[PDB]
């Protein structure tokens, strides 16, 4: 189906102990492929997927230059936003940025994003039309007015619907063996006992992409009254999730677990 | 590839 490319940036100020910590990661769908860490010795953009390693040295020089430029921009912005919020030098503060694009199965542009945060809360976001901004507070109004009148916002729009889509197409073709795959979940149920009461855990393991839906149902009725854990990485590119429900004993076949995943032909139903 | 040629806040 559709595909996405995302870049994530975190800049954390370090009052009195040097420059801020800066970490950048790039994702294609749910697969990370690049990273930069200002505390690492290389001081280069580094590959994190096999298919990106085949890019030549000009790619890595360009990516290293632009990631350091992003880092310097956020370092300047940390000092600027500190003044906007009338904060002191003593405290630590964080700027987070996410941006990217989505493409359809045809590879055509679907949407673009650019969202900025300060200390874990929305600061400014690009609207869906890629030519207007939503500012979350009064300090962000200053940035919004600056960026509304900035010719650089025209190039950002051209990157998100243009350049971003083109690079994503190139990555998808180069990583066709892995990025285009879809691993169905391996499902099973476990039983764990007071008396006349137990827990049924419905497992889903080794699936890609991360999107999945697990639901418990009693007598065909949705049972959202259940414990759902957050989808977690297995460490090998696949993901895990489980849903558990408390069951009075003897009622084991009243309960059904339903697994929805794009790697499944039809949604699975599980009975203990 | 990364976006480039941006501006300050």
């Amino acid at each position: 189906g559709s595909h996405s490319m995302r870049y994530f940036f975190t800049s954390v100020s370090r009052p009195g102990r040097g420059e801020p910590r800066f970490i950048a990661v790039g994702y294609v769908d749910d697969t990370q492929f690049v990273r930069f860490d200002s505390d690492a010795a290389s001081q280069r953009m580094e590959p994190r997927a096999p298919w990106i390693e085949q890019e030549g040295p000009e790619y890595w020089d360009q990516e290293t230059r632009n990631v350091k430029a992003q880092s310097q921009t956020d370092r300047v912005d940390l000092g600027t936003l500190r003044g906007y919020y009338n904060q002191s030098e003593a405290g630590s503060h964080t700027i987070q940025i996410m941006y990217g694009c989505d493409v359809g199965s045809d590879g055509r542009f679907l949407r673009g994003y650019r969202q900025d945060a300060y200390d874990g809360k929305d600061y400014i976001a690009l609207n869906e039309d890629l030519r207007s901004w939503t500012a979350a507070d009064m300090a962000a109004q200053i940035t919004k007015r600056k960026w509304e009148a900035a010719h650089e916002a025209e190039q950002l729009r051209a990157y998100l619907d243009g350049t971003c889509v083109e690079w994503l197409r190139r990555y998808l073709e180069n990583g066709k063996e892995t990025l285009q795959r879809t691993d169905p979940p391996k499902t099973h149920m476990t039983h764990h006992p007071s008396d006349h009461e137990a827990t049924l855990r419905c497992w889903a393991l080794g699936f890609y992409p991360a999107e999945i839906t697990l639901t418990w149902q009693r007598d065909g009725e949705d049972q959202t009254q259940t414990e759902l854990v957050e989808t977690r990485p297995a460490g090998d590119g696949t993901f895990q999730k489980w849903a558990a429900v408390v069951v009075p004993s003897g009622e084991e076949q009243r309960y059904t677990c339903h697994v929805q995943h794009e790697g499944l032909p039809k949604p699975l139903t599980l009975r203990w | 590839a990364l976006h480039g040629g941006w501006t300050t806040k």
Partner: T-cell receptor, first 111, second 114 residues
Framework: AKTTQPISMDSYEGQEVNITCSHNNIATNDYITWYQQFPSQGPRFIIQGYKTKVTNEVASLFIPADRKSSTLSLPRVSLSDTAVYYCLVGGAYTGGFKTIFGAGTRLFVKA | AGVAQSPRYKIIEKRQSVAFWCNPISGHATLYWYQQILGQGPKLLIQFQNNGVVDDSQLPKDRFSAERLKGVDSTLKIQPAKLEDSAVYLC????????????FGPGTRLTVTE
């Protein structure tokens, strides 16, 4: 060098001066930037744009829809505006990283 | 305060050395060295991002060398100068990178006589 602009231009003081620069191989991530260099001085930034016409107190920069050219417009030139005007095209990508000033346009203002 | 450069004028003889110095605007991450020979526009010699060299394509490395070791001020050296080295050498800096405004220093005028 993506840019071609006239070698020199003559104008009388008080006239509007328009300098057109041709860059038909402009890329998506390219900006159009103009610099002005007075004698015995280094170049000085005057304006940068992407698509939309940009105006400041020094000049205006007009860019057509196809971005294949651009025109720097000096509103009302004085004798002190005699300088070299460079049209630059580049951006934050491998094919545009290097700054290339070129020969520029030598504007001479006559009294 | 803008970009500072040193020296302003220099006269030397073919096959001897000279060292230009530059101090950019405080906090600027990118530093540029330009050579401008008479009748032509500036030509980029070397570009620094932080303390690392980022553009060397047009540097005549047999004679031209430059260092910005701590990422603030840079020194450009010519050894040994040739007759064609007579030019104005300009230093510039930008807050982030090449798409930003490049603030230029006063420049260094170098004449290399026989």
């Amino acid at each position: 060098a993506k840019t071609t602009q006239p070698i020199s231009m003559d104008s009388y003081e008080g006239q509007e001066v328009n300098i057109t620069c041709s860059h038909n191989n402009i890329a998506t991530n390219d900006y159009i930037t103009w610099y002005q260099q007075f004698p015995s001085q280094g170049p000085r930034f005057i304006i940068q744009g992407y698509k939309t016409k940009v105006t400041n107190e020094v000049a205006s920069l007009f860019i057509p829809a196809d971005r294949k050219s651009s025109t720097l417009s000096l509103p009302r030139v004085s004798l002190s505006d005699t300088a070299v005007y460079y049209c630059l095209v580049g951006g934050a990508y491998t094919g545009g990283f290097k700054t290339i000033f070129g020969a520029g346009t030598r504007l001479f203002v006559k009294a | 305060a803008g970009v500072a450069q040193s020296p302003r004028y220099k006269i030397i003889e073919k096959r001897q050395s000279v060292a230009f110095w530059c101090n950019p605007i405080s906090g600027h991450a990118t530093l540029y060295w330009y050579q401008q020979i008479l009748g032509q526009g500036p030509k980029l010699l070397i570009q620094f991002q932080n303390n690392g060299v980022v553009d060397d394509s047009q540097l005549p490395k047999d004679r031209f060398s430059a260092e910005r070791l701590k990422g603030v001020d840079s020194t450009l050296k010519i050894q040994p100068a040739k007759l064609e080295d007579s030019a104005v050498y300009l230093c510039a800096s930008s807050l982030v990178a090449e798409t930003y405004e490049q603030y230029f220093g006063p420049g260094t005028r170098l004449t290399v006589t026989e």
